[PDB]
Amino acid sequence: MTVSIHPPATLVAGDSWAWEAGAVFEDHPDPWAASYVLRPEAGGDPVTVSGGLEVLAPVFRLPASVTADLPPGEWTWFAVAVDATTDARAVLAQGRVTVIPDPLAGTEDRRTPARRILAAIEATLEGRATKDADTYSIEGRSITRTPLPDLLRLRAVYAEQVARETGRSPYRQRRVSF
Amino acid sequence: MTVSIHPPATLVAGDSWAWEAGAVFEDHPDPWAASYVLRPEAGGDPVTVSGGLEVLAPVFRLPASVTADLPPGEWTWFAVAVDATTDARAVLAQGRVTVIPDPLAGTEDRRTPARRILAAIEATLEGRATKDADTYSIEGRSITRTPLPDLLRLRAVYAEQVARETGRSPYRQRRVSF
Amino acid sequence: YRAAKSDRIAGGFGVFPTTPRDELRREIRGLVGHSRHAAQNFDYARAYEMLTRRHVIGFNGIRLQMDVRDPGGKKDVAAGAQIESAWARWGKMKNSPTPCGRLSWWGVECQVATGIAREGGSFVRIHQGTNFGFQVEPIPFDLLDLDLTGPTPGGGFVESGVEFDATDRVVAYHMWSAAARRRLRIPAAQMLYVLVPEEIGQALGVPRSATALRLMNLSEKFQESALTAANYGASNMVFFERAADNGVVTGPEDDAQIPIDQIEAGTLTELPPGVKAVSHNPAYPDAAVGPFLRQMGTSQAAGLGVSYETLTADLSGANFSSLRAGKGEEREEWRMLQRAVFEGLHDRVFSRWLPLAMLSGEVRLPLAKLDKFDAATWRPRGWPSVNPKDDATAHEKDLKNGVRTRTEICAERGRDFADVVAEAAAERQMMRDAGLDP
Amino acid sequence: YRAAKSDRIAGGFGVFPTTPRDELRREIRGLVGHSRHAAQNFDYARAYEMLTRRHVIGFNGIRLQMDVRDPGGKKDVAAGAQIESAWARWGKMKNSPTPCGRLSWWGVECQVATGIAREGGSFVRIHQGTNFGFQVEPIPFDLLDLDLTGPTPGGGFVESGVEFDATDRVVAYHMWSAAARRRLRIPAAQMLYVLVPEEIGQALGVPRSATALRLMNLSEKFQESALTAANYGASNMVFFERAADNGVVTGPEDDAQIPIDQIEAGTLTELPPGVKAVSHNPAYPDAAVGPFLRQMGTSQAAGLGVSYETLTADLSGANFSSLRAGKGEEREEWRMLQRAVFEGLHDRVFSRWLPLAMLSGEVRLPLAKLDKFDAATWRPRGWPSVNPKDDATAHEKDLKNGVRTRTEICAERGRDFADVVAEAAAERQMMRDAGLDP
Amino acid sequence: YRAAKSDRIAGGFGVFPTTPRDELRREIRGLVGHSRHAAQNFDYARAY
């Protein structure tokens, strides 16, 4: 039947989460429960949200303290209504939400991989600028580095992604304006 | 609700920092605090800014002496309002700011990597101008340097970046002007 | 025989024959709504509207000449003068013509005609007592109730707001309302609907713009897109494309504050670039458009029953002959519409107006011999020719051969012979003071 | 039938039919504002404005001729002379025509007409006592209050500032204000709104430039971009492109001080370069523009109800016949507008003016028989033909066949037969001194 | 009806109707100055 799967796409950890779905569980309203199962995709144990609501409009809420240790990464949203007498469950929803690493705590969090790759390329290029060598072969060991044209290509592709995520990616424009 | 995440993008160390945000914490004004969490991206411990303000307009300020040892590099800005009775925090802001290395102190700071790579290329080319050799192979050791056409390409790409950062990058124009 | 039998690979011809009626009613409600939109927002149709009105209405409107009896000696001018004078009087600006009062008779004709094109017909109603009397007010088409349907046990169907009788004759109409009290059965005598007949079995008339309504919407959207693309093409100027090497770490922070302004004002500005350059070639429709647009356009014109040159002022590639032919075809169409609009409105109004006016004594004459003054002829106005010399020579030759009577020539212009003779008597008095002719 | 029924892939035809009224009011407030902007900043419309004014107004303005009664012997010239003289008097520069005093009657007609095109109509109000009397002042369109709405328990709706009655007849208007005291109910007698009727069910008139308003904005922006691109293309001259090798360490410091000037003045200047050269090829619309612009332009003209050649002076590719046809179509449109503007303003003003002027004795005549001098005819002025010889021959032939009366020919020009006869008497006196004709 | 109502992708038609007067006065002072310049330095207008 009707369904309202709309958790905010950007769900931040340690923060209270609410969608107050409009009509997902309107089918089987009398004897079936509300769930909004949230499952970590790679590991974890599905956590669930119940009701705690006003009767006319269901409002779904999760306490901030409980969110606490939830996994940083990608999470899935599926909504299930279930009744024991019926011995059936019914699934009406689908979605995908990402958990931002807890912003109020922790020793360290770096940027998404695009930054890491980019930073490293700058580092490796720095080394090979000096001490130039395509074969550091001594005694029985030979390293043979990746061609310089190749490294450059990687830098460009990655740099563009970092720009896209930041949102400063639109191609630049200079106005002659006399 | 409303939010005013605008720390000046160029935040200099050892200097007092202020945005005096207009409306970020207008939601939950009565029982929730002001934070403007500043966290070093690669390491560090989140430092925070409170109020110390006039009632009508909140003004956020950080003492210069406290800034002192803050990490040189990239920093993130997230604003959180939190109430214990509510057992919830609310995050309304996002941003990115860079900390210029303290300009009033220190033994040494070089330029950003673009300069380093460029300087080195000039150095390596200098060496291979004389003593020309693509295989310094003696006894059991063989070096095999990077091709000269390749080194040249690196120089050009980097030189352009240094120009862009300085801002002297616009392509040159000669006016015939009779 | 088996040419259009079905829809195998090149059809769509329905499956079974259906009554144009129901299809016609749904189509017309939807279309009145649609034409309302097109005329207001697109183009070409605004032009149809203008064209129709002007050609079919009148600088002098449509005038009335009434012949009492046989025009040899049995018709007399006194009654004629009186009636004409009276009609024209209230036709001129006055409190009497409408329950408005920004309008007049000319206005009502023009408007009823515009309404007619756009909505495929419209109605007017007459009121007596409040006023004189018999004031005519036009009512908007949308007022009619499409939903009232269902026959009475002792009565005929009331579908599309028309009250049929046991003879299945028209007797009442069922407009919605003033809006508030809805539903008012109105006697047919009060409400007259002009209809421009096409297929006979209809209770209503379609907007005459239906055939081109689809083509025009698409065309206006197209005209709006092309100009915009051309502007963009002129604006982006050159693109400085690069090979796949650098552009690395274009810093994010500088981007937000400003788009750089670089001065190229100086005349000679040879420029040196780091990598490569390219010049945008606009593909905005360039000269393809003139031929393409015209062909789609010709189709629309044929559909609306008007010459292309009149509908859209392309006015290109035409010799004298081509223009003459086009005018001739349109002239026939206009004539047909002209007869119809006044076949209905004028005749009903003149007849109805006469008794009240006679009773009010507004017009001075006796009521009992109504028939003697009953006849009433409405005169349309024709359009002038490009080559007057030829026409004049032909006309002289015709007058010579007793083939054309003098009256007909005047009629084509629309002026009329009595008018001509009165004016001639005035010219004769002007001769007494000075001179006549050699 | 099912041609425009919905908006599947090629539509937008609303969803349900709606009253043009509300749409019309919102559209018109927005559009008066919009036309104000276009006429002032774009182009082509400034041209419409100019065109409308000139064609519809007058070198001689619009004059007045009044016939006392039947023009055989029952109309007399004395009353006519007196009335004409009086009207023209105050029409000429004087304190009496306006509560301004930089203006005159001609000015008021021209202006009311310009206002009419651009804003789809405008109003004038008359004042008596301060002065003579009956001075007419035009009031700007924006003064009207669009917001006043809501019916009274004993009264009809006041929407769009119009006070309807229990008969739903017009009785009052509700302009904002002078601005300061806002809101003044003004009696209809004082304020008259000319309306150029199109669709009948409207309380207001749209700017006649609405159809082309969208197309023109886009077009002017385009014309502004193309010229600029062409200038840039001519200016950058050659680009000295390089392969991907050097240009290294172009020093930052030298850049700020100056852009180098290099002399190429000498005629022969063969030049040797370090790497490579290229020549900019301008892609600025070159010859594509003439055809592309014209086609979009034709559409606008059709929308505004004017021939393209008049609206924009392309004046290209036209044979004699093409020009003649175009003029003929426009002539009809102008005639229609001409009748309407004076259908309203002149008639109301002449009628209203007469009593006060008679009472002030400004005009000498008795007040009680108002009807004898009541009739008043306004005369428009026509436009002259390209080929006079043909016209003259045709006219002679027509005068010969009693088909055209002498009066009509004069009317087309707009001069009039009485004028012609007075002038002829003057020519006869000039004959006494010298000679007449052979 | 809704042809020029706003400035979605192809407009610029102000936002609200305004008195040509004030606009007219500012425009005219600026323009007398401007025409003075054009007539003297450009072309075509010298011709007008």
Author numbering:
A (entry chain W), B (entry chain X): 1 to 178
C (entry chain L), D (entry chain A): 32 to 162, 213 to 260, 269 to 527
E (entry chain B): 32 to 79
Tell me what the authors wrote about this structure, in their words.
We recently characterized a novel roseophage, vB_DshS-R4C (R4C), that could infect the Dinoroseobacter shibae DFL12T, a ubiquitous group of Gram-negative α-proteobacteria of the Roseobacter clade. Here, we report the atomic capsid and in-situ structures of the tail machine of the marine siphophage, vB_DshS-R4C (R4C), which infects Roseobacter. The R4C virion, comprising 12 distinct structural protein components, has a unique five-fold vertex of the icosahedral capsid that allows genome delivery. In this study, we use cryo-electron microscopy (cryo-EM) and structure prediction to determine the atomic structure of the phage R4C capsid and the in-situ structure of the tail machinery to characterize the distinguished long rigid tail.
